[PDB]
Amino acid sequence: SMKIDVVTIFPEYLQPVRQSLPGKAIDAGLVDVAVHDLRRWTHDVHKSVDDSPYGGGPGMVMKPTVWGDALDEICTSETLLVVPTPAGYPFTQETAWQWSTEDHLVIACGRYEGIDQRVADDAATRMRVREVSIGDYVLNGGEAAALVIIEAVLRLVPGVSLLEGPSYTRPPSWRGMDVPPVLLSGDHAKIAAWRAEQSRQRTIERRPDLL
Amino acid sequence: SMKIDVVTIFPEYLQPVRQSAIDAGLVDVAVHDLRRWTHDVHKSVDDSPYGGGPGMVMKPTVWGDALDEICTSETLLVVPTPAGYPFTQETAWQWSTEDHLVIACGRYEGIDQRVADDAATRMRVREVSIGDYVLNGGEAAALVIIEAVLRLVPGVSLLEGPSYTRPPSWRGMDVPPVLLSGDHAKIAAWRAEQSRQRTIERRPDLLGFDS
Numbered sequence A: 001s002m003k004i005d006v007v008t009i010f011p012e013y014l015q016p017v018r019q020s021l022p023g024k025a026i027d028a029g030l031v032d033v034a035v036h037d038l039r040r041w042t043h044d045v046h047k048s049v050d051d052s053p054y055g056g057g058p059g060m061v062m063k064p065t066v067w068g069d070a071l072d073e074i075c076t077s078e079t080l081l082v083v084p085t086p087a088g089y090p091f092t093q094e095t096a097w098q099w100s101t102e103d104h105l106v107i108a109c110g111r112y113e114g115i116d117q118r119v120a121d122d123a124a125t126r127m128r129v130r131e132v133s134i135g136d137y138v139l140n141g142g143e144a145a146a147l148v149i150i151e152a153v154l155r156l157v158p159g160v161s162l163l164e165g166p167s168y169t170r171p172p173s174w175r176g177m178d179v180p181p182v183l184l185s186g187d188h189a190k191i192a193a194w195r196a197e198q199s200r201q202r203t204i205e206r207r208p209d210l211l
Numbered sequence B: 001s002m003k004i005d006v007v008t009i010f011p012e013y014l015q016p017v018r019q020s021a022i023d024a025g026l027v028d029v030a031v032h033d034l035r036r037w038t039h040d041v042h043k044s045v046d047d048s049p050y051g052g053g054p055g056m057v058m059k060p061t062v063w064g065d066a067l068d069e070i071c072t073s074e075t076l077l078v079v080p081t082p083a084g085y086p087f088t089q090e091t092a093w094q095w096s097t098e099d100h101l102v103i104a105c106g107r108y109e110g111i112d113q114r115v116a117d118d119a120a121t122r123m124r125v126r127e128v129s130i131g132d133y134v135l136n137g138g139e140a141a142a143l144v145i146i147e148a149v150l151r152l153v154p155g156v157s158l159l160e161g162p163s164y165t166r167p168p169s170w171r172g173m174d175v176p177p178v179l180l181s182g183d184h185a186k187i188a189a190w191r192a193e194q195s196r197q198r199t200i201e202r203r204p205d206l207l208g209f210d211s
């Protein structure tokens, strides 16, 4: 039902998620995740994936000729091409819900100072392209962002406001701290009102932006 | 010199962290199986929630014993959660000069709140969200935090605009001519404008605008 292809110079980084897929979902053909080494599409004996930036500056830029060949082979007209980058649109739960009904995601993982912009611009003339940031911080490359996106999207695939407040379980008293007595009261309308107020307080303290 | 301890019921999920820094040896990262601290033959770590609700909650008893052994009063205890304070670049800079991080990874519907409250009587505790989306547990968040922090350890605003490298013409698409001009002032000005242009389109909040 959904195919995900990931392209990276560090394919071992994605082995965790591959193994973590439920066997029943793979057997039922609901999901398939494949990982590809970008160096398969290099042109030279030194397997070069990067080169110096035009206009000067620090670091290196990933080569358009290598990426163009990789995406030509892996993508089709139905592909949603996902490019993690700290300069992207924000990736949120709404994004995850939208992508959860797609037939084919391809995730292009960059390194160094990113991928030559002509790769995305060319791809966008024949498929849908989405440059996205998973948060306001800088990573070394796109692989950890790909793990986050794969997890958040696939858990919404059929088969595979305010902040939530505190949770409790047994025992009822632990290291001098008792579970809030209202949760043991059997008054379920009161419990719901108590949880709402805990959620309001936590949102004011930790995420005033949400209000 | 930093030490990072990660506690989880899925230690195998943390092996992408062998993308080193660790090789250099200024940082040490160790992964611990929470089930090591259980006592029953079935190694139970979870129980149904007080007050009702779907799912299960991780028991405080097992976590308390694990953290007793791993943490000291100097530890910064990090707890990934969708209900946390935001983890940002500023957070990453702050944590980059810490001697000891311990990252407690939850599963199910999270960890009994008394674990963090008890720990806070002895050490500094930080509940944090890496972004506005829901994962299946804290492990992918741990990987994101480790990468954002370690790249800042000594010895290791606006959005970045587009980058380019050779060849100067590819598939009929040209690198912006100013980047080939060798005029540092004109290049700096073009780049500044591309960045502010990308920021208003993708992240207007960074410049104090709606949405």
Ligand SMILES: OB(O)c1ccc2cc[nH]c2c1
Pocket (backbone or CB within 6 Å): A084, A085, A086, A109, A110, A111, A112, A113, A114, A132, A133, A134, A135, A137, A138, A139, A140, A141, A142, A145
């Ligand atoms: O911070 B991140 O979202 C991110 C994503 C992709 C690349 C490529 C090179 N650095 C990157 C950082």
Ligand SMILES: OB(O)c1ccc2cc[nH]c2c1
Pocket (backbone or CB within 6 Å): B080, B081, B082, B105, B106, B107, B108, B109, B110, B129, B130, B131, B133, B134, B135, B136, B137, B138, B141
């Ligand atoms: O979305 B996340 O930031 C996150 C973090 C921890 C847990 C534990 C259970 N679900 C979780 C989700």
